[PDB]
Design a protein around this ligand. Sequence first.
Ligand SMILES: CO/N=C(\C(=O)N[C@@H]1C(=O)N2C(C(=O)O)=C(COC(C)=O)CS[C@H]12)c1csc(N)n1
Length: 263
Amino acid sequence: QTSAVQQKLAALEKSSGGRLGVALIDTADNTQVLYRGDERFPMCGTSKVMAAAAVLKQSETQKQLLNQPVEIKPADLVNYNPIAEKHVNGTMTLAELSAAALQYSDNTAMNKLIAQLGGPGGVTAFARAIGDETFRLDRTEPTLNTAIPGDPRDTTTPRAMAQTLRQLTLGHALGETQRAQLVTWLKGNTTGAASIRAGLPTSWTVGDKTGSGDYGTTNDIAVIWPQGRAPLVLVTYFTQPQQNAESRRDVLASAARIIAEGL
Ligand SMILES: CO/N=C(\C(=O)N[C@@H]1C(=O)N2C(C(=O)O)=C(COC(C)=O)CS[C@H]12)c1csc(N)n1
């Protein structure tokens, strides 16, 4: 059985020619609205939230960890390095790497976060530790974005990622200081203007992390503070049948617009 919300999302999906996954959590009453909420989708860059959060968790017992400089070698650079390329044969702190990964989608920065955690398995272990039984990170940048049909690697479900994002940014999966830091980073994201943000009222405060990959994979996960009511969490994942499909950030904006009706 479907609601009018789900019917609108299905119609959007059909018009788009792809596969759409949505999960909304309204923290006013803890209700969820889902569309393909339990199907796996390639996370691409939305996985960077879990990596940054894992490092924040480490820093709860290692107080200066975020300020630890990490060397950036020429050989570290991968396919998209807008911030890390400015520090070749130099350093970035784990805070700087987190900010670059989250706010500029820097892939070299993500690889340093992954390395700090002992590899992709270290990111997954953190996910399990905070109760996310679904998330899996298998690869480093750039190959974690291959978004191949049927490939379970580097996937999660909209429901799991929404629950996790809620716990990380509004709940207490992190310490109070670390939760606030993650919120600060997400709020300052530079890559999200055309995605979930474009489908929500401009007066609402939004923190988000985008992701993109092959098969026209176009993703965004967001924590949302509407005008005068409890915050929301929204995950929008989208992927398409053919490898070189174009990005469709407009589909994410449209999904957000649909979800926001009556909120
Ligand atoms: C093998 O890796 N392939 C990638 C890829 O690096 N995706 C990553 C991801 O998620 N990113 C985001 C992202 O956050 O969406 C942006 C966006 O950065 C900015 C400036 O908005 C830059 S690319 C990076 C890719 C991306 S699209 C396509 N066919 N492939």
